[PDB]
Amino acid sequence: MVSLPRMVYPQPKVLTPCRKDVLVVTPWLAPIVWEGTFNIDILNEQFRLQNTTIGLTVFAIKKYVAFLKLFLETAEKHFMVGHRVHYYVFTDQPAAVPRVTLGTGRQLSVLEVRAYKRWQDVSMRRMEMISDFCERRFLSEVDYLVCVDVDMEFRDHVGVEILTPLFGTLHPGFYGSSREAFTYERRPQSQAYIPKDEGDFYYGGAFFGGSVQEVQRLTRACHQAMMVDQANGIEAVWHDESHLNKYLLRHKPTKVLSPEYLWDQQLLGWPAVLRKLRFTAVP
Amino acid sequence: MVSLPRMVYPQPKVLTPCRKDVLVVTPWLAPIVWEGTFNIDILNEQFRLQNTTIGLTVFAIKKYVAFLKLFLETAEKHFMVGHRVHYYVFTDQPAAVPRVTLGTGRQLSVLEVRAYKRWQDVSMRRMEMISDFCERRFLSEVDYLVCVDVDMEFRDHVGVEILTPLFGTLHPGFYGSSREAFTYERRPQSQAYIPKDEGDFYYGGAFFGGSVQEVQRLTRACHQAMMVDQANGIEAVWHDESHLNKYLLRHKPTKVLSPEYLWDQQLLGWPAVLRKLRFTAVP
């Protein structure tokens, strides 16, 4: 990219690990993003000089519209602050979207979801609609897409350190688990099947993203795999999350976010290995 | 990219650092490549499925042609084995290039260097010629370029783990040093100037590379900066290495290679922090 200006910051210490308690790079040389691994001033400079725009997608269906107010208010406080942001709120109730005041350079669009009589089409809807909109809007409007669940709140910084062609996030229930305990789809009849001796991580369906092109590829692949399963009369154990995990096994993400980025404090507390709780379940 | 096949390998351990003695990721989230950070089977699969071709440039002038035989023979044993390779040997003595037997998928071209009466044009020649050839040949012929010194030998694996848009390599004399001890150009009159309170690492001019596009950008910038200095009657303290360091300060590399990749055992021994000595000075 274009040149960085002069900056004064502490010298990296080649002979001091940035973390001694966690893995900070995958075996395919993707950073695993934890507090202490990044200097956000450097990263903010890099992404601002590229005039980066980040799209954030969220689905709020039926009673989940109640979560939008806190979700958006806290995103204003913590998500990509200083950068251009475009929120895309997919909902069955446009009139229920709260009026949240946004900072400068930040916009929100409301998109109405296709109503479906079939639960099967509802299960596939997020991957289908994200894939479809990667064509209708996102390619023209944003550089990266971040796809998250709405029943959540931002409690701390979530910023440009996550941005990369393709990322997944360590599910908070499994980051310390052996792969045989991961709740992957285990039936060979499903497109999402992963055998007991395969798997890097258990990624959460509640937080993934990347460049628009990589997100279009991921979501199309997952949608097409779910349609195959539907034809074959099988529903993966964890729905689109199972397919996300199959996709990221075979297409390795270029960053992995630590569970700082996807947490549930009620269920899991605040372990010492989490220096920050950034994006968390609402009680 | 296209999907990886099923592979059986050890699960990554989220709560076990891959190294406890060294920094494995820069503060701008670039991997620092050390033994123990990568699974080469995964990386080989990724790069082979992309049918990657790696170009290697080397300059052998005057008596340095004597180093070519060992350089090329050891590159055959250790450099990008299994991948497509194109060696580009830039020399003032084409007839002195040894006939080294190459493995399948590997080729060598000899390019004669522009003779210069001015030492100034010789100092600039590598950056100028690499930049020029990024247009004449490299863009059409290779996906990545690796630019190294000839007075060296491969002693161990140097492979696709290094490949990325832009990389530099930690100079073996300075990896444990404070930035004020780095031998950057310190005169503000030079384009290569770096103040005492700036700098991430001291990168070696003997090993850098990246995608053809990024290498063209780097080498053009360094060439143009050296021409400014020549006009202003200043020669940077460490010549093109000083300019390389200025460029990589302001354009952060997307990987950094550890001194495993650039070593001198006669001067520095074999410290415990080096698990492998991959590319080393010839006594």
From Swiss-Prot, chains A, B:
GO cellular component, one term: vesicle
Enzyme class name: transferase
Any GO BP annotation: lipid glycosylation
Active-site residues per Swiss-Prot or TrEMBL entry: E241 (nucleophile)
Topology in the lipid bilayer: Single-pass type II membrane protein
Record note on modification: The soluble form derives from the membrane form by proteolytic processing.
Localisation per UniProt entry: Golgi apparatus, Golgi stack membrane; Secreted
Impact upon substituting E241A: Almost complete loss of specific activity in group B transferase
Main location: Golgi
Functional pathway: Protein modification; protein glycosylation
UniProt GO molecular function: antigen binding; fucosylgalactoside 3-alpha-galactosyltransferase activity; glycoprotein-fucosylgalactoside alpha-N-acetylgalactosaminyltransferase activity; manganese ion binding; nucleotide binding
Binding residue positions for UDP-N-acetyl-alpha-D-galactosamine: F59, A60, I61, Y64, D149, V150, D151
Record's keyword annotation contains Manganese: yes
Ranges of the Lumenal topological domain: 2-283
Role this protein plays: This protein is the basis of the ABO blood group system. The histo-blood group ABO involves three carbohydrate antigens: A, B, and H. A, B, and AB individuals express a glycosyltransferase activity that converts the H antigen to the A antigen (by addition of UDP-GalNAc) or to the B antigen (by addition of UDP-Gal), whereas O individuals lack such activity.
Domain notes: The conserved DXD motif is involved in cofactor binding. The manganese ion interacts with the beta-phosphate group of UDP and may also have a role in catalysis.
Record's protein name: Histo-blood group ABO system transferase
Organism whose genome encodes this protein: Homo sapiens (Human)
Full-sequence range covered: 64 to 345 of 354
